[PDB]
Amino acid sequence: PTHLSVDTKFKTEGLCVDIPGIPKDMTYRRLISMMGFKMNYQVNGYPNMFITREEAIRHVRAWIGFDVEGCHGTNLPLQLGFSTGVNLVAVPTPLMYKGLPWNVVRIKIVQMLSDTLKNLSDRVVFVLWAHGFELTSMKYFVKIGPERTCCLCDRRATCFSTASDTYACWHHSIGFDYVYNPFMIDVQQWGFTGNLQSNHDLYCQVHGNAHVASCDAIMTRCLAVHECFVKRVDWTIEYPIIGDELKINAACRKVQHMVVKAALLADKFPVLHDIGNPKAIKCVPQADVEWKFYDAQPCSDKAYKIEELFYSYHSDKFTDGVCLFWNCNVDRYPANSIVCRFDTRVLSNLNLPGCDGGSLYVNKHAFHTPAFDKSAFVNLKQLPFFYYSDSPCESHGIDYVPLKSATCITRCNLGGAVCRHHANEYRLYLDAYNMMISAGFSLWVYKQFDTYNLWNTFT
Ligand SMILES: CS(=O)(=O)N1CCC(O)CC1
Ligand SMILES: [Zn+2]
Ligand SMILES: [Zn+2]
Ligand SMILES: [Zn+2]
Structure with a gap:
């Protein structure tokens, strides 16, 4: 057969x-x-x-x-x-x-x-x-x-x-x-x-x-x-590598760890509600925060109603701390959120035209995604690009032109001059970030998010 x-x-x-x-x-x-x-x-x-x-x-x-x-x-x-x-x-x-x-x-x-x-x-x-x-x-x-x-x-x-x-x-x-x-x-x-x-x-x-x-x-x-x-979903079927699948998936994991780690440092939330993939792992394992998971498979038909995910009786108080929706498509995000949402309108060899405005995203597995809707993000703002690092300024072991950037949030940049290591890591992160955005992913964050709050983590 x-x-x-x-x-x-x-x-x-x-x-x-x-x-x-x-x-x-x-x-x-x-x-x-x-x-x-x-x-x-x-x-x-x-x-x-x-x-x-x-x-x-x-x-x-x-x-x-x-x-x-x-x-x-x-x-x-x-x-x-x-x-x-x-x-x-x-x-x-x-x-x-x-x-x-x-x-x-x-x-x-x-x-x-x-x-x-x-x-x-x-x-x-x-x-x-x-x-x-x-x-x-x-x-x-x-x-x-x-x-x-x-x-x-x-x-x-x-x-x-x-x-x-x-x-x-x-x-x-x-x-x-x-x-x-x-x-x-x-x-x-x-x-x-x-x-x-x-x-x-x-x-x-x-x-x-x-x-x-x-x-x-x-x-x-x-x-x-x-x-x-x-109406029928099979996430076990594997699809061949035809483009930048590996780099896009690696970039997604780097951006997630970066954004969540910085939100926790800048606003010190006591609890994080991770809503999405039932197989998710803590993206910032060293963080102090109380990490609570909530299972929601990728929605293939319509976006999840926030009322069904949160209500009908968990910390129960999703209003406490911050909510992380990493590729978890909901109708309207709560104000205290960190969101990664795939934009179905994106033109790429991985994104095929779908049903009812939605698109079929094929990267290792096939995921029909509901139509991108700008009104889902009314309580949030676009997450601006930034690179944050608290690692030591140490080269170890690629030719150079000194980096000048207001978004390289590091001890060396605070002290007036970006070290070679953080310049190499900044340009690598900028490349991963651009890869992810161009692949169709869009990043959104709670309105009070301010990278200026990250400089005082260098004392
Ligand atoms: C196609 S999507 O909505 O961006 N999403 C990411 C990949 C998969 O793990 C869950 C679904
Ligand atoms: Zn040929
Ligand atoms: Zn149709
Ligand atoms: Zn440095």
């Missing part, structure tokens, strides 16, 4: 308006054959064009919503819509392009998929709400065969060129005309009542319906993300 058997039954009711007379009894084997593809009894890594829900979840970075609408089918032009917002018109002779033959349309499809996916995944998974025309249009831009490698590198082949008779990955496919060995999943097979729009709109008010193929492609991928990452 690893791939989707070609002998699995495929429900054809969704296909019968575009394909009247379609047999009710149908397998993936017969559907693939009907789509114009011959699998030739091949044992070469590509057993089925269609994949399971579990395989699709493991390859969520490859998801591209795909829909085809009849503009007027060998006689009529087709509108091809992709969840990237692209609409192409193919003639058989929200970016909307005018009607062109398939030989040029297929060049555009390969360029669009390669640019969207080269930094995300080794493949493409066409996410469908299958009605017929999308499946029958695939022979015009898709080639299949044994699993292959790129002509210029070791990555698996995702494109084919008829001009050169060669294969390429998404990074080396310039000028390629066919999508090679794509994968696909029909959401309609999962068991839904009603059309695409009525199922999508139950969970999402951000994607409308301009009545074009890309709107359906977007709604389709959105509904699939809702089903696989919002």
Whole structure:
């Protein structure tokens, strides 16, 4: 049990308006054959064009919503819509392009998929709400065969060129005309009542319906993300390293220890309420403070209501000391808080578009995150950058230009001149901090927080 058997039954009711007379009894084997593809009894890594829900979840970075609408089918032009917002018109002779033959349309499809996916995944998974025309249009831009490698590198082949008779990955496919060995999943097979729009709109008010193929492609991928990452959550699935994952996670741990340690020194809170990950560890283990933990898993649907986290009867007095919400998404933070909140609007290879304004954050694990909302932070202010250190001024063991900065809160800077060690540590921390902010994380703190209160910790 690893791939989707070609002998699995495929429900054809969704296909019968575009394909009247379609047999009710149908397998993936017969559907693939009907789509114009011959699998030739091949044992070469590509057993089925269609994949399971579990395989699709493991390859969520490859998801591209795909829909085809009849503009007027060998006689009529087709509108091809992709969840990237692209609409192409193919003639058989929200970016909307005018009607062109398939030989040029297929060049555009390969360029669009390669640019969207080269930094995300080794493949493409066409996410469908299958009605017929999308499946029958695939022979015009898709080639299949044994699993292959790129002509210029070791990555698996995702494109084919008829001009050169060669294969390429998404990074080396310039000028390629066919999508090679794509994968696909029909959401309609999962068991839904009603059309695409009525199922999508139950969970999402951000994607409308301009009545074009890309709107359906977007709604389709959105509904699939809702089903696989919002109402169903699997934090055990591991995802490959495709970017700055390790550095971002290391920066997050450095910034957390820095900010919390300084808040405790500047305001001397007697108690800290750590609300979030049930597996959390004390980020400042040497601090004097009474550390109390409260379990809350990452919310994937809507942000937690502060009334449910704190009320309904713990120190009980969350108003005492300070509250630490490190990636714990709540509707409205209390005034006495230290907050790290992921901004879902951020553009990155780790952050994929999500459901209802939310985003799918994929860094080792997949975490659907509720929409970033500026009103959650009305009792707080933006945490300003600062570096604090009470370690001894000692080099030990990288060329130098003397550091001058009002935000290097150290004994050496208090005494007029930043030592080499604290300058090296300051620039390293500034790099980690910038990495974290640029990755989408935003930092917020109680209004009375003032770094001027840190200088008297040097007496
Ligand atoms: C995606 S998020 O909300 O920023 N968050 C951080 C990573 C994980 O440990 C919990 C969820
Ligand atoms: Zn390559
Ligand atoms: Zn949506
Ligand atoms: Zn120093």
